[PDB]
Ligand binder design. Structure first.
Ligand SMILES: CCCCCCCCCCCCCCCCC[C@@H](O)O[C@H](CO[C@H](O)CCCCCCCCCCCCCCC)COP(=O)(O)OCC[N+](C)(C)C
Ligand SMILES: CCCCCCCC/C=C\CCCCCCCC(=O)OC[C@H](COP(=O)(O)OCCN)OC(=O)CCCCCCC/C=C\CCCCCCCC
Ligand SMILES: NC(=O)C1=CN([C@@H]2O[C@H](COP(=O)(O)OP(=O)(O)OC[C@H]3O[C@@H](n4cnc5c(N)ncnc54)[C@H](OP(=O)(O)O)[C@@H]3O)[C@@H](O)[C@H]2O)C=CC1
Ligand SMILES: *P(=O)(O)OCC(C)(C)[C@H](O)C(=O)NCCC(=O)NCCSC(=O)CCCCCCCCCCCCC
Ligand code: SF4
Ligand code: SF4
Ligand code: SF4
Lengths: 156, 341, 53, 176, 115, 208, 77
């Protein structure tokens, strides 16, 4: 159909820009944040993929929860996630952000950032290598490609 | 009971509540509240969705690992309905639109889909079925919404005789229609009201109260085949209610009478939007219609929930509609509206 | 490290150098500005994993 | 011994004073910085073309876990729970019982990959080289539950990566 | 020891004086806490909660324990005044998301093994 | 020679013992006990009300210039009448040495704040209070440093459970993070690792 | 002093736990009205609200009756 074809091509166009223009928030906790820095380093340059760090959550599309989320920090992480405008995606990195990590049975650690914010991608490791995080970012990009928002709207 | 369905724990996040609930229309306002309550209780929740998976993201942190399961379903697909209700002992029906799209109408969302869900659930052996209807569901109602509501309620009762049919009056909350719709008339200059809102009496009900009643109806053993009416504790005139809404929002209130046919034409103009319409003729009819009084039907007090008055939770919804000048004004700063009891 | 004769340490206090430096951050930032405070934090070289433990 | 980093003093002769004045007026060190940056511009970048080019690794690399087998196909694990005892994060759960042929074999062997710290103590404590940390590291998942491995998943990982794991163990087992 | 070192307040009279002073400090702060944090509760609710939190330690008969309690109360107040806390903690005082725990023997017997 | 056995330092042992005798003679009013461990570490156990005089002496005396406060912590021993054991580790750069000063206190007894002797005592004593419940009398700003705002209980006590009593999560109904009673999907598994056979005869205690 | 008396009585009558029917200028807070220390503290703070001046804690304890309150205020003008 003409309408279905138009909405499919338009959805592919929209998903391409979001897929190829990821702007993660400058946000790191604990040891896992160093692997983000090595990913940004020349060896595994994230900028060549369209992945550019931005400081303001308003101008950010992806939150990389990289490191341990504590009880004293959870309100701030939730606040910045809320202040980040839609569409927004979440990549948790490392065992601490995935589940509890080395500090699962701790009185002051949140056993998983998904108790606070909806997580789109989980990157396993302690810390995951820069290659592993780059693979996670590419997997997030492929996940973005499969979104069909205009196709859902047209058939709604 | 099956050994896996025996409740365990202290009713926390990681406990077992023995409830396996398929929540149709969970990607909505009442749906999200009900799913949150179920997950907090510690139940197995299945979320049938037809929308984009991105729009189901907020439901993920609502339960522990493996308790929320997302399965794609189609409204006119009994195979998908059976797939999503195969292993659940409770089925909750909250599907409903306030407008009519090209493919789905009020007949589809309120008669065909609820009847299909009720009939397929009966074949699958689902123990309990909760079905959400409207309080002002009249077979000869002026609104197609309410006519379809009544017909679908009859069909659901015919298909699943052991159902619990809940009839909320007018749900108000953060992501609601009621308070937001009445507080969003700022942009169109004044507030158009039919007969200046002097002939309409409404008693809105709190969303958390509705969700708690829905949860309690599941745990109540002697609410199997019943009909409950969920209404608020206070009844207001429409004029008084809108005046209180604008007073809490700290917006100037300039009401004016608009004849019913003119308001219907205005609603007809606004419903040509392919996206979610701001208002429709059916919405205008429902707003003008007065909330019915049904003393014989049980309610929140019968289910064990004390209805929360509007004056306590109005500031949760209407503080967003204020400006920086009045953002920090306290809850007590605005006098309660004039009730009609 | 305090050991009570068993196979598990009874007490383990960890003295990180960044704790005292960050404690002294306030004094070093007297009569300075925001950029100067940024520079002072950088020159103190604080890692909050070891600061907090 | 010790040395002073900043203890020099500049000569006050006329030539040095004029050189410093020229450096102040004509931004010589700024031009030097520009030249260094230009040199780096004309150098060759160190960026690898991922995923078509992969970073170097070693046989000792700790990645995704796996449960191995003897060449006969029998499982190596003997349910001795040494890995469970030594696991710093308590990420391993083991339950065993006598098999139909009387072997000491596990019925439950779960590893929580959101709790594991990938420290490699389990493969050190294994006396039969059953549990290993293989070479795979690209196993990111879209859901939390997929990272809660069990015995079936770990055996599948072992069968999937057995050749590379065996080669790495052959290459590095003389240092252990 | 028979001669226990006093933190301050000596006997229980000065401890009660400090308790009343801290109660006044908390009471005059509830409107500011409601205004700044943009709480949806009433001022009366906040004052009632302060009163309840004071009353749950009314059985203490040791001046040193009372002094430590008022020290920690002043610490909590200075956390609130300086907006170090968020709405999260102030509402954590209210336990707004807990289900009503049963207290009768029959309900406890029905729900589980909890004494 | 014994390659696997750490060598002893009799010179340093004798020097530390002589200095311990020196300080014990100088300050009989507070010094309860002096010890030198066999790996050359000097320890002084003093009365709790002598913290300020002892630290001031060990900081300002010409023969004891312990200018740097290396560490300050506490050890919780519930079986003692005074459970908390406050430990000061001091470094003397002029004489290239280290010393340890240990006092005792319980829940309700304050310990005089030593921020007038060393400035690092500010944050160190704040941490001690936050983690053990020990109150320091003249502290310029005594408040929690590491625990969450509004946290109840002092985590490092031996009787405080490992996972605490509350846990945090985001509740969508109230649109904020909430604190709820702790509930673990998998309980921490307690291991009894001690062998029932005595390991060190030298540390055997009288049966009594 | 009649103005002070009526202002004090107006403040007292607004208090929820104060019974206006049994309320009188000579009614003791602890005995006649059956209050406690914190209720008296709240009453003293409300009195500070009306007259806009500070009441020391030692002075605040010597105001157990409305007559005592009005006498203290009159002495302080
Ligand atoms: C002014 C108004 C806005 C203007 C917008 C239109 C102008 C721009 C037109 C579109 C820009 C180019 C879009 C196509 C990009 C092609 C690049 C190519 O590499 O993409 C491939 C194909 O592109 C996408 O897959 C298809 C979607 C993009 C094209 C959509 C169809 C055309 C839409 C309408 C275009 C004209 C607009 C008309 C209406 C305004 C697959 O890439 P991908 O797999 O990801 O990368 C994997 C990583 N690799 C490379 C290392 C392997
Ligand atoms: C003068 C004309 C002003 C032009 C309109 C300004 C456009 C902006 C309106 C707007 O953005 O809000 C629409 C607003 C809310 O939608 P959103 O804001 O998108 O959702 C967020 C809800 N909080 O729509 C509504 O719900 C209002 C309902 C309209 C019913 C009343 C219409 C009556 C028309 C006037 C009568 C005169 C006819 C003679
Ligand atoms: N809200 C109110 O004031 C009152 C509501 N009710 C009734 O309560 C129920 C819940 O209402 P509410 O949450 O406010 O409304 P919403 O519009 O917010 O939610 C409707 C839900 O049904 C789903 N849905 C809609 N159309 C279809 C379809 N064709 N096929 C499948 N799923 C569909 C929606 O999913 P998606 O995101 O894909 O569209 C969404 O999950 C409704 O039945 C309504 O009639 C009764 C009284 C008052
Ligand atoms: P009258 O003197 O007869 O009665 C006095 C009282 C009722 C206090 C007792 O009879 C009494 O004196 N008891 C003696 C023991 C004692 O001192 N009890 C009081 C302990 S002090 C205390 O518990 C302080 C606690 C800190 C305050 C809690 C803060 C909570 C703030 C919540 C704010 C809500 C958000 C707005
Ligand atoms: S997962 Fe490991 S590397 Fe990452 S923050 Fe936790 S301890 Fe550090
Ligand atoms: S690598 Fe370490 S933390 Fe991970 S399962 Fe093995 S022993 Fe446990
Ligand atoms: S250490 Fe090896 S043999 Fe022992 S239980 Fe673990 S995997 Fe099995």
């Amino acid at each position: 159909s003409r309408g279905e074809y138009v909405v499919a091509k338009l959805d592919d166009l929209v998903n391409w820009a979001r897929r190829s223009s990821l702007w993660p928030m400058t946000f790191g906790l604990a040891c896992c944040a160093v692997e983000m820095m090595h990913m940004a380093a020349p060896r595994y340059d994230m900028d060549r993929f369209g992945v550019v760090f931005r400081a303001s959550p308003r101008q950010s599309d992806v939150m990389i929860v990289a490191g341990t989320l504590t009880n004293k920090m959870a309100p701030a992480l939730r606040k910045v996630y809320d202040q980040m405008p839609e569409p927004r995606y979440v990549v948790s990195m490392g065992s601490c952000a995935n589940g509890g990590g080395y500090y699962h049975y701790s009185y002051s650690v949140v056993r998983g950032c998904d108790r606070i914010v909806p997580v789109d991608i989980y990157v396993p490791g302690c810390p995951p290598t820069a290659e592993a995080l780059l693979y996670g970012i590419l997997q997030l990009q492929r996940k973005i490609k499969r979104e069909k928002r205009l196709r859902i709207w047209y058939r709604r | 009971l099956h050994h896996a369905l025996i409740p365990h724990g202290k009713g926390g996040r990681s406990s077992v509540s023995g409830i396996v609930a398929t929540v149709f229309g969970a990607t909505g306002f009442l749906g999200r509240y009900v799913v949150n309550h179920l997950g907090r209780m510690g139940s197995q929740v299945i979320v049938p969705y037809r929308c984009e998976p991105y729009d189901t993201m907020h439901l993920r942190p609502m339960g522990d690992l493996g308790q929320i399961i997302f399965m794609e379903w189609n409204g006119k697909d009994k195979d998908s309905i059976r797939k999503v209700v195969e292993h659940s002992n409770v089925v909750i029906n909250l599907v409903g639109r306030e407008w009519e799209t090209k493919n789905f109408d009020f007949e589809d969302v309120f008669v065909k889909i609820p009847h299909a869900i009720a009939q397929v659930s009966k074949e699958a052996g689902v123990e309990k079925l909760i079905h959400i209807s409207h309080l002002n569901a009249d077979i000869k109602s002026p609104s197609r919404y309410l006519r379809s509501k009544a017909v679908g309620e009859k069909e659901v009762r015919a298909a699943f005789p052991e159902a619990t049919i809940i009839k909320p009056s007018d749900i108000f909350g953060r992501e609601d229609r009621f308070l937001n719709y009445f507080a969003s008339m700022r942009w169109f200059g004044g507030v158009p009201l039919i007969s200046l809102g002097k002939e309409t009496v409404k008693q809105p009900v709190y969303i958390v109260d509705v969700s708690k009643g829905i949860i309690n109806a599941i745990k109540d053993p002697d609410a199997k085949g019943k009909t409950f009416a969920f209404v608020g504790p206070n009844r207001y005139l429409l004029f008084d209610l809108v005046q209180y809404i604008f007073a809490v929002a700290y917006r100037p209130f300039l009401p004016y009478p608009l004849p019913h046919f003119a308001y219907r034409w205005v609603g007809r103009l606004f419903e040509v939007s392919p996206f979610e319409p701001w208002t429709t003729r059916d919405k205008v009819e429902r707003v003008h219609m007065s909330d019915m009084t049904l003393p014989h039907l049980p309610g929140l007090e019968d289910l064990g929930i004390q209805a929360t008055p509007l004056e306590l939770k109005a500031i949760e919804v209407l503080r967003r509609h204020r400006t920086y000048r009045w953002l920090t004004s306290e809850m007590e700063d605005v006098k309660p509206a004039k009730t009609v009891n | 490290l305090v050991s009570d004769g068993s196979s598990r340490p009874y007490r383990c206090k960890i003295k990180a150098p960044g704790f005292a430096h960050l404690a002294g951050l306030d004094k070093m930032s007297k009569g300075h500005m925001l950029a100067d405070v940024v520079a002072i934090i950088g020159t103190q070289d604080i890692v909050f994993g070891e600061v907090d433990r | 011994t010790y040395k002073f980093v900043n203890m020099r003093e500049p000569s006050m002769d006329m030539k040095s004073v004029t050189d410093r004045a020229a450096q102040t007026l004509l931004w010589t060190e700024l031009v030097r910085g520009l030249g260094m940056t230009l040199s780096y511009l004309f150098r060759e970048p160190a960026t690898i073309n991922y995923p078509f080019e992969k970073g170097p690794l070693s046989p000792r690399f700790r990645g995704e876990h796996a449960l191995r087998r003897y060449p006969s196909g029998e499982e190596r694990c003997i349910a001795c729970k040494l890995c469970e005892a030594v696991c710093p994060a308590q990420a391993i759960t083991i339950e065993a019982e006598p098999r139909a042929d009387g072997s000491r074999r596990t019925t439950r062997y779960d590893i929580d990959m959101t709790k594991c710290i990938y420290c490699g103590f389990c493969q050190e404590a294994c006396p039969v080289d059953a549990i290993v940390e293989g070479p795979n590291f690209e196993f990111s998942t879209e859901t939390h539950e997929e990272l809660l491995y069990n015995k079936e998943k770990l055996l599948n990982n072992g069968d999937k990566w057995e050749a590379e794991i065996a080669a790495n163990i052959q290459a590095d087992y003389l240092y252990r | 020891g028979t001669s226990v070192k006093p933190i301050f307040s000596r006997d229980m009279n000065e401890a009660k004086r400090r308790v009343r002073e801290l109660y006044r400090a908390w009471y005059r702060e509830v409107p500011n806490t409601v205004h700044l944090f943009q709480l949806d509760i009433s001022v009366k609710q906040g004052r009632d909660k302060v009163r309840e939190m004071f009353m749950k330690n009314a059985h203490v008969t040791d001046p040193r324990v009372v002094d430590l309690l008022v020290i920690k109360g002043k610490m909590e107040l200075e956390e609130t005044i300086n907006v170090w806390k968020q709405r999260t903690h102030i509402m954590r005082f209210f336990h707004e998301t807990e289900a009503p725990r049963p207290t009768d023997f029959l309900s406890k017997f029905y729900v589980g093994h909890d004494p | 020679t014994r390659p696997t056995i750490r060598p002893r330092n009799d010179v340093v042992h004798k020097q530390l013992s002589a200095f311990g005798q020196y300080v014990a003679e100088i300050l009989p009013k507070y010094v309860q006990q002096v010890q030198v461990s066999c790996f050359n570490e000097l320890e002084i156990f003093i009365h709790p009300d002598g913290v300020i005089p002892v630290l001031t002496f060990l900081r300002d005396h010409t023969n004891a210039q312990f200018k740097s406060l290396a560490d300050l912590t506490a050890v919780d021993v519930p079986t003692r009448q005074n459970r908390f054991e406050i430990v000061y580790n001091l470094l003397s750069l002029r004489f290239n040495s280290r010393i340890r000063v240990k006092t005792y206190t319980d829940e309700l007894t304050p310990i005089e704040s030593s921020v007038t002797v060393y400035k690092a005592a500010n944050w160190y004593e704040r941490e001690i209070w936050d983690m053990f419940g020990v109150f320091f009398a003249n502290h310029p700003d005594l408040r929690r440093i590491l625990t969450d705002y509004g946290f109840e209980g002092h985590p490092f006590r031996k009787d405080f459970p490992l996972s605490g009593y509350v846990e945090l999560r985001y509740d969508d109904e109230v649109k904020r993070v909430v604190a709820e009673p702790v509930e673990l999907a998998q309980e921490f598994r307690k291991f009894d690792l001690n062998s029932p056979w005595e390991a060190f005869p030298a540390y055997r205690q009288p049966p009594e | 002093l009649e103005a002070i008396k009526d202002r004090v009585l107006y403040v007292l009558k607004l208090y929820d736990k104060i019974d206006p029917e049994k309320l009188s200028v000579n009614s003791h807070f602890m005995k006649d009205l059956g209050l406690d220390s914190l209720d008296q503290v709240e009453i003293i703070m409300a009195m500070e609200d009306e007259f806009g001046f500070e009441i020391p804690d030692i002075d605040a304890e010597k105001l157990m009756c409305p007559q005592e309150i009005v006498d203290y205020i009159a002495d302080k003008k």
